[PDB]
Amino acid sequence: VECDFSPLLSGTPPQVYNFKRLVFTNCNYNLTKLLSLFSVNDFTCSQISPAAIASNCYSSLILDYFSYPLSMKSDLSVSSAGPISQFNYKQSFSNPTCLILATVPHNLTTITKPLKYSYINKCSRFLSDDRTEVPQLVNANQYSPCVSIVPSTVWEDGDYYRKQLSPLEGGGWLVASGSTVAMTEQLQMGFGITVQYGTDTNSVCPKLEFA
Amino acid sequence: QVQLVQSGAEVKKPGSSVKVSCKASGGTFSSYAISWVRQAPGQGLEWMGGIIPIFGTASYAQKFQGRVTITADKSTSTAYMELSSLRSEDTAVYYCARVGYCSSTSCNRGAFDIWGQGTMVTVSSASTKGPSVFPLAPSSKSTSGGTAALGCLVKDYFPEPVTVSWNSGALTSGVHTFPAVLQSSGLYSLSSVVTVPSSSLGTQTYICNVNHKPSNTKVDKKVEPKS
Amino acid sequence: DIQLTQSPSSLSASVGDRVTITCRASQGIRNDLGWYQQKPGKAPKLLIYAASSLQSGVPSRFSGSGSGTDFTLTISSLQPEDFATYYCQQLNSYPLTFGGGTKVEIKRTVAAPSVFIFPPSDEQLKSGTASVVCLLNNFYPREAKVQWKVDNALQSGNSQESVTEQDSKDSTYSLSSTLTLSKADYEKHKVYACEVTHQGLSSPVTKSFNRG
Ligand SMILES: *[C@@H]1O[C@H](CO)[C@@H](O)[C@H](O)[C@H]1NC(C)=O
Ligand SMILES: *[C@@H]1O[C@H](CO)[C@@H](O)[C@H](O)[C@H]1NC(C)=O
């Protein structure tokens, strides 16, 4: 009956390039209650409004969450040509989306902090000709191809990652670089919401209130 | 089996800057990082910084941050190490090296499998000067039962190094060329001796072949016994 | 910063015996340690990466072990070519830190120095300077004391010395010391001597000469 956002509230949230995705169908949600547990610093949406996304029925609701430093807010926009939207995370274009930047309050101890913030700064294929470099831009609703060679938490800023590819996998090399951001006093996160309307299967509805 | 070829020796005044090149020979940088290491005379090894040629990402030891710049030209596979505000304590041999094996945390950190031949950099207020070559004559005060000592004194030159041979390479046995010592004047000085049979002092000619490339100086000094 | 303590600083050994060099990190570095070898006047050479993995071509007599903090480079049966300086290096974090180094010399019998002395050449004397050279040839061990005495007066601050690298054939060292005075000060005095103290000498030996 009710949509469960519990996995979000427990454990250490991953970095942006390893965003955790929750998919909701056939359930009732209370978005306002979820956001009341956090300090929402920023709440912007595309092809929908913050008020409307908390009060509409959908055929599916996708929620992506990850550790994200509040300072790099503008980098988390596709309008910007930053490494975040190029190599890490990229929301859908043909579907209404929302982006929430929140800070974990001290009374929410169930959410633990990672060692630091970190993201993919570079991600490219180095071909077998030892010359041509092919940048691997992340697609919507997909992970970076370099998530296989980039660790879940980057050790040092500007670290280098290199993996040799078999002929079957196009040969050459898979090459990536990662950046780090020092951990804030309180854990800061990002939330990516994507909704999709249908015809009859619009069963992801806001939890209404009764006597 | 790629090789790393570095630029020639450098002589700089205090406060100036130097830029050493490191070119891949008989191969390419490929997907490998290039680090830089220096070594002062008699001292150990020290990491300065490194770079990822493909990305141009550079890392530095905090000791040198502000005075060091490491670049890389990917079109020619040539790395560079620029060190500015040179002090006398920067007098050292500078090596480039390839990060051939990734560590557990990254691939710009790891063991250096291929090294360049190194580049000597000397920082001093002294100016380049050719050596004065003086003979060390053999005598009774240099003879000990059939064997006599003789040599050359290579004094007051700058900078390092000097090479000395005997009889144009023919005489190699019993030859000791000592490491140069730095005098208080800022000039270097060394000796080169050779023990020979004491019976050959009346016939055999012994010539000191002193070479000092930085000053374009070659001196040949014939050593004869003194009496 | 990760600190690496390499011990011992130096050791003497014969061809064929077991040699152990230890490296200890100030904190855990898993297996991110490298071992290098360096000969005088040449670039360092990679022996072992990942604490235990032998570099291609390096003889199997070199063996690295250890994990975390304590690491060891073991050389099972020393060959002539193994006598050099060995360096530790951690690969874990910035900055890439090297160990202090271990100098492996050749152990041989105590050899007394052949002490010779050279008066300044006439060529140098007419330039205004006088250099007297004292030569300690082919001795072991390398620890040796040289002292200049002008007219039996001990000298200080006007002499410099250097020792050659250990000879790879007879395992000896040689020392050259240069006493430098002016033309005027040189002619002021009579006897010039260097005194040599060495383990192979029953007593300090003096080689000297007079101006003439
Ligand atoms: C949703 O959560 C909010 C908490 O801010 C609460 O006020 C509201 O009553 C909840 N709605 C329902 C239907 O439970
Ligand atoms: C926890 O802190 C948040 C701060 O935004 C506050 O809104 C909430 O009421 C607090 N809850 C409890 C149980 O203290």
Residue numbers in the entry:
A (entry chain A): 381 to 591
B (entry chain H): 1 to 52, 52A, 53 to 82, 82A, 82B, 82C, 83 to 100, 100A, ...
C (entry chain L): 1 to 212
What does the study report here?
The most potent mAb, m336, bound to MERS-CoV receptor-binding domain (RBD) with subnanomolar avidity, and inhibited infection of pseudotyped and live MERS-CoV with an inhibitory concentration required for 50% neutralization (IC50) of 0.005 and 0.07 μg ml−1, respectively. In this study, we analysed the immunogenetic origin of m336 and solved its crystal structure in complex with the MERS-CoV RBD. By using genetic and structural analyses, we discovered that a germline-encoded antibody, m336, could achieve high-affinity recognition and neutralization of the newly emerged MERS-CoV, mostly by using allele-specific residues, as well as junctional amino acids.
A 2.65-Å resolution data set in space group P212121 was collected at 22-ID beamline at the Advanced Photon Source with 20% glycerol as cryoprotectant, and structure solution by molecular replacement with the DDP4-bound MERS-CoV RBD and Fab revealed two Fab m336-MERS-CoV RBD complexes occupying an asymmetric unit. Fab m336 interacts with the RBS on the MERS-CoV RBD. The interaction surface buries a total area of about 1,700 Å2, with 860 Å2 contributed by m336 and 820 Å2 by MERS-CoV RBD. With HCDR3 and LCDR3 on one side and HCDR1 and HCDR2 on the other side, the antigen-binding region of m336 forms a claw-shaped surface. The claw grips the RBS with HCDR1 and HCDR2 penetrating into the concave surface formed by β5–β8 and HCDR3 and LCDR3 interacting with the outer edge of β7 and its entrance loop. It is of note that a non-canonical disulphide bond forms between Cys98 and Cys100c (the Kabat numbering definition) to stabilize the HCDR3 into a ‘twisted’ loop conformation. Indeed, ∼90% of the m336 epitope surface overlaps with the DPP4-binding site on RBS. Importantly, in addition to precise targeting of the RBS, critical chemical interactions such as the salt bridges between Asp539RBD and Lys267DPP4 were mimicked by HCDR3 Arg100e of m336. Interestingly, Trp535RBD, which interacts with glycans in DPP4, was engaged by m336 HCDR3 residue Thr100a and LCDR3 residues Asn92 and Ser93.
